[PDB]
Curated annotation (Swiss-Prot), chains A, B:
Function: E3 ubiquitin-protein ligase that mediates ubiquitination and subsequent proteasomal degradation of NUMB. E3 ubiquitin ligases accept ubiquitin from an E2 ubiquitin-conjugating enzyme in the form of a thioester and then directly transfers the ubiquitin to targeted substrates. Mediates ubiquitination of isoform p66 and isoform p72 of NUMB, but not that of isoform p71 or isoform p65.
Tissue expression from the record: Expressed in heart, placenta, kidney, pancreas and brain.
Superkingdom per UniProt: Eukaryota
Subunit structure: Interacts with the phosphotyrosine interaction domain of all isoforms of NUMB. Interacts with MAGEB18 and MAGEF1. Interacts with the Coxsackievirus and adenovirus receptor CXADR. Interacts with endogenous retrovirus K protein Np9. IGSF5/JAM4 interacts with isoform 2 through the second PDZ domain, other isoforms may also interact with IGSF5/JAM4.
Name of the featured protein: E3 ubiquitin-protein ligase LNX
Entire-sequence positions represented here: 12 to 135 of 728
Length: 124, 124
């Protein structure tokens, strides 16, 4: 099932997926999934993971992956505006590569699909 | 009075000061002092400022500078490990320019003074 937000085939239970043409800073990479952070969540111990990744992690485990300190989801908090701004401006390559060559900021890919991507218009 | 940590002339009531040879991302700049963040503090509304800057700001004002939402210091929290890692690796130029040309990561300047700076050894 092709996602209308990121243009990749993934389930409703999985993260959005992106292809980054310029390398992403290792400090913006989620330690659970090894992709650039999406919907970042902070732990009380100061670590940061994708919301979906930490949520799924804590169903079958009960510690922070980075320091093994006990951890529960309800004391985690969405990351700051600053962190979201740094992630939103990461460059991504449109996944409809047979129709489109567009590189743009990650926060703008959905809009690109809705307005001016020949791939999204075609679909497959 | 020359600071042993940053090598600049400033009082105990003022921030550390640095010269950045490569431009710093605007999203890492403190909106109060307009320098790259030092000892970053997050507000409940998700904004980030230097600890010293927000502390001094809130003595004579009682709102978040970015959104004018009422704000008190005691509900602010130190920024995440991620944010600190991004700031620590910013490049700075040794301030003892008549003795030394060293560029290094901001978190390593103090150590440079203590071990291998001809400026710091000389002082003035
Ligand atoms: Zn998606
Ligand atoms: Zn993740
Ligand atoms: Zn942790
Ligand atoms: Zn496209
Ligand atoms: Zn100083
Ligand atoms: Zn400041
Ligand atoms: Zn605010
Ligand atoms: Zn030096």
């Amino acid at each position: 099932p092709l996602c209308a937000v990121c243009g990749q085939a993934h389930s409703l239970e999985e993260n959005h997926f992106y292809s980054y043409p310029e390398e992403v800073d290792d400090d913006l990479i989620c330690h659970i999934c090894l992709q650039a952070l999406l919907d970042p969540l902070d732990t009380p111990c100061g670590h940061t993971y994708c919301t979906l990744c930490l949520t799924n992690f804590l169903v079958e485990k009960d510690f922070c992956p980075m320091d093994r300190k006990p951890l529960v989801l309800q004391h985690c908090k969405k990351s700051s505006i600053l962190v979201n701004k740094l992630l939103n401006k990461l460059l991504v390559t449109c996944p409809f590569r047979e129709h489109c060559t567009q590189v743009l900021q990650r926060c703008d890919l959905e809009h690109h699909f809705q307005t001016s991507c020949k791939g999204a218009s075609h679909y497959g």
